[model samples]
Target: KQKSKYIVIFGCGRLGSLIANLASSSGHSVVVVDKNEYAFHRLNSEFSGFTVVGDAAEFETLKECGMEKADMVFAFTNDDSTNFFISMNARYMFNVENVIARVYDPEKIKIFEENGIKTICPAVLMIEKVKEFIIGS
Candidate 1:
């Protein structure tokens, strides 16, 4: 059984909400932050986590999410730059051990990884999946 973790998620868009729902359902303590409260509506009914309506770019917002005590942080905003910034703050400032960011631009993934921040590039992932399917077929 996996241990329950205190997880903080930045952004409540499709990706963030999905992650939040999964984490919460898995028994992890989750707190999701977003600039718009409406974005949190994407979270499913089974989601048992808390939501904070605030800009993730703000230091106070990060603090409000209890980043200091978070075991993991996910930066999943639609904007690549914002995701990078949030990932950096979570890893460096808050010293979170597990920091993941969703980056749209494949070219910027290297820099994020080089900084010790893990990244998920949807475009690259989709392309790789398509290539794998073609090879398998």
Candidate 2:
């Protein structure tokens, strides 16, 4: 059996909700943050986690979400800047070990990497997939 983790997500968009549902359903502790409480409704009914309604860029909100004890933090917000701020704070302020961010812009990937935060760039991944399909590689 896979060991469960205490996870914190800094968004409640489609991608964020999907990850939250997956993590919580797998028996991990999860807390999702978003400025709009309604955004959390996107999470699946199986999600057994908590939700925080506040700006993810604020340290107080993250602290309220139990970030200090989180094993992993996901900055999957819609805005790249928001993701960057959340990921930076999660890594530096909370000392989180695994901080993963979803960056839509490929250009911002290096900026996130320079701060020792890992990023999942959907734009780059999609382009790579297109290339692979075109070249059959």
Candidate 3:
């Protein structure tokens, strides 16, 4: 059918892989894109969907995976700038509204939000987690 309601995770590392797994298991088709070859190598038959190895910044790599066809784009790469760039591309260029990114710096989250991109900050998550741990303990 039309695009299959998929989410293309831009990084296949810890966060990206978990997102892919959970999304795919939830009956959503996943097209995982990552620059690292070893990341998908560990996947092989374990994954139910497709995998592509290349940089998201490259237009060809993104188009090859049908980036514009995705229901949502998760720019969850480790680098803040790269994720920011990809998130902007996914939203602005492709008209994908449900764009989410993993920002390394919490300071940039507001900047990203101002541009209309959803962001998850690792530093913020860890801070809240630590506070909860200390409070509970």
Candidate 4:
């Protein structure tokens, strides 16, 4: 269902890199933006998506990362505040239909939900997964 859609991701960390490659490998057009020049190095050579170096919260950087034409926007930065800002701009400014954010702090997930942004908290998920893994054995 995502083959024709375009995706824009803010941050190129572990979660961000995995999401970008997964979406792109599934035939979606993907672009990733990171303020740190070294963050792009995390993406493997097999990832066939575009990468931009800049603060993703800036308008110019988002435009350069193809956010204007993006069907979905993901904020995978480790900082909750940064993710909130990026997702807010993507939702309110760009009018993106789908906005997903990765939040490290479980406490901030409700704030994103109140703002109409979908979120995945890795800290919480990891705990849940670890429980399931231990219990299943």
Q: In terms of TM-score, which candidate is strongest?
A: 1
Q: In model 2, which regions exceed 4 Å deviation? A: none
Q: What TM-score, to 2 decimals, does candidate 1 have?
A: 0.93
Q: Candidate 3: which stretches are off by over 4 Å?
A: 1-4, 42-46, 129-137
Q: All candidates: CA RMSD in angstroms?
A: 1.8, 1.6, 3.0, 2.6
Candidate 1 structure quality by residue, lDDT tens digits, 1-137? 36999999988888888889999989999999999999988999888879999988778887888888999999989998888889999889988989999988899999999988988998889888999999973
How far out, in Å, is residue 136 in model 3? 11
Top candidate on lDDT is 1
Cα RMSD (Å) between model 1 and the true structure? 1.8
Roughly what TM-score does model 2 have, to 2 decimal places? 0.92
The 0-to-1 C-alpha lDDT of every candidate, in the order given, reads 0.89, 0.89, 0.84, 0.84
Ranking by lDDT: 1, 2, 4, 3
lDDT of 4 at 33: 89
- Superposed Cα deviation of residue 129, candidate 3 (Å): 4.1
| lDDT, candidate 1, at 78 | 92
lDDT by residue for model 2 over 35-91, one digit each (tens)?
999998899878897888999877787778778899999999899998998998888
Q: Judged by lDDT against the true structure, how good is candidate 4?
A: 0.84
C-alpha displacement of 26 in model 3, angstroms?
1.0
lDDT of 4 by residue, 71-109 (tens): 899999878888898998888888887899988888889
Looking at model 3, report the run of 10 residues with the lowest lDDT sum: 39-48
lDDT per residue as tens, model 3, 21-54 = 8777667788999988788754535568889999
lDDT of 1 at 135: 91
